[PDB]
Copies of this chain bind each other. A is one copy, B any other.
Amino acid sequence: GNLRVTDVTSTSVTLSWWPEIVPLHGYRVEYREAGGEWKEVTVIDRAPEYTVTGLKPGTEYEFRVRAVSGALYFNASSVSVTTSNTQAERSIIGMIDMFHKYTRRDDKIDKPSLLTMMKENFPNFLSACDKKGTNYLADVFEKKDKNEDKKIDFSEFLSLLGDIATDYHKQSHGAAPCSGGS
């Protein structure tokens, strides 16, 4: 969520995430000079700030980020430093990036990570489900893991969004949250 520079020195750039109140369980930070060669560095557990160093004073530096699931973030990213996307489009790109904040190398999410994402991304909806006396996290994985691989690929994750999206449209028409006797 908005990849931003928070301090710049003559050979050290600092970057922030501000993701799900927490980053992605791993994030590559690629960087090159203006017409440079991409240098990578893999940060780990939920570190929301990373500072690059060793750079050249008064030099143009490009940056971009990837996921454990070998894939880029922020659309295609690319910021620059010297030492027209519509709301709906951006709303799309973020959701992919949300997937890619929990997926491991395979680009799929395990039950541990899924229940995390839920809690950090859809908290008021989960709370809602409690208030009525529904435990969504019980049978979410088994429901949306139709293929029973014990892994949520994008496809399976979309079907989830689809179920939440539904609720919100229901809620829009005025349906008390977490409706689904099913």
Please report A residues at the B interface, Cβ cutoff 8 Å: 1, 20, 69-73, 75-76, 84-89, 91-100, 107, 120-125, 154-155, 158, 161-162, 164-166, 168-169, 171-174
For A123, list chain B residues within 8 Å (CB): 84, 86, 89
Q: Which 9 A-B pairs have the closest CB atoms?
A: A88-B121, A72-B172, A91-B91, A71-B173, A71-B172, A92-B168, A96-B172, A96-B169, A96-B168
Residue of B nearest to A177 (CB): B76
Interface residues of chain A: helix, strand, loop or mixed (majority): helix
Partner of A89, one of B97, B99, B121, B172: B121
For A125, list chain B residues within 8 Å (CB): 89
Question: Given the complex of chains A and B, what is the CA–CA distance between A174 and B95 in angstroms?
Answer: 16
Partner of A162, one of B86, B99, B162: B162
Residue of B nearest to A174 (CB): B71
Please give the distance in Å from A137's CB to the nearest CB on chain B: 16
Interface centre among A84, A96, A166 (most CB of B within 10 A): A96
Residue of B nearest to A21 (CB): B86
Q: B169–A99 contact, CB under 8 A?
A: yes
Given contacts A162-B162, A169-B96, contact A122 B89 (CB under 8 A): yes
For A120, list chain B residues within 8 Å (CB): 86
Q: B124–A89 contact, CB under 8 A?
A: yes
Q: B168–A122 contact, CB under 8 A?
A: no
